[PDB]
């Protein structure tokens, strides 16, 4: 079978980004030893090791949706993957408010129409299980108390 490739964006500190960029544009396999990525079983934490120097990483959710588009003639572009995550290196914390481009900054706060967390469904599933495992349930919409 075929599995859709999973592309994400890696953001590095600027000096480390310059060393990684020089090693990528060089093209040797020396970069392969120099740059490693360890993703922790949290799923939202990691180390990126540039030249064997550890950097602390967080995999965050991006507010917009990006799409990689490949081409052979620079006139027709074929969509290859959807990018929604970024492993910035240096829950609410794992959500990025800004977009990658310069015009998109504070997009989630200003350029996004109010949208719901769809979280609440999981919380309701937790309450329903407790109700069904009980015997007697008493409910009242309340006031200030």
């Amino acid at each position: 079978p075929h599995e859709l490739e999973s592309q994400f964006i890696l953001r590095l500190p600027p000096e480390y980004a310059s060393t990684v960029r020089r090693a990528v544009q060089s093209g040797h396999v020396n970069l392969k030893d120099r740059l490693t990525i360890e993703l922790h079983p949290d799923g939202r934490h990691g180390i990126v090791r540039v030249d064997r120097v550890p950097l602390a990483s967080k995999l965050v959710d991006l507010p917009c949706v990006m799409e990689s588009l490949k081409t052979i003639d620079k006139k027709t572009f074929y969509k290859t993957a959807d990018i929604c995550q970024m492993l910035v290196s240096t829950e609410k914390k794992f959500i990025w408010n800004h977009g990658i481009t310069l015009p998109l900054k504070n997009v989630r706060k200003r350029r996004f129409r109010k949208t719901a967390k769809k979280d609440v469904e999981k919380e309701v599933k937790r309450l329903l299980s407790t109700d069904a495992e009980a015997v007697s349930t008493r409910w009242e919409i309340i006031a200030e108390d």
Binding site: L127, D131, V135, S136, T137, W139, I142, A143
Partner: protein
């Protein structure tokens, strides 16, 4: 009392001006400095929280009762919507 050219031209100019503004906004390479003020809703129209009493049996012999209060209007809506639907499933 125009019901024709006035409406059409007004719509056209709002379209062109809006488009121009959008073009100016997106192609900006100006750096933007890093919550936007919004109306804050009350705990629902009624301003009412939800409290649930649960009766369970512990190991050996016991009959403890748990009173749990849900102050989140979002959890409330989804909870009681299901309860009202169930009241009608029978």
């Amino acid at each position: 009392r125009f019901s024709v050219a006035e409406h059409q031209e007004r719509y056209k100019e709002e379209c062109q001006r809006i488009f121009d503004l959008q073009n100016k906004v997106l192609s900006s390479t100006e750096v933007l400095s890093t919550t936007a003020s919004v109306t804050s809703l009350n705990s629902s129209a009624t301003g009412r929280c939800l409290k649930i009493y649960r009766t369970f049996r512990d190991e050996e012999g016991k009959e403890y009762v748990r009173c749990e209060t849900v102050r989140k209007p979002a959890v409330i809506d989804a909870y009681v919507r299901i309860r009202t639907t169930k009241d009608e499933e029978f």
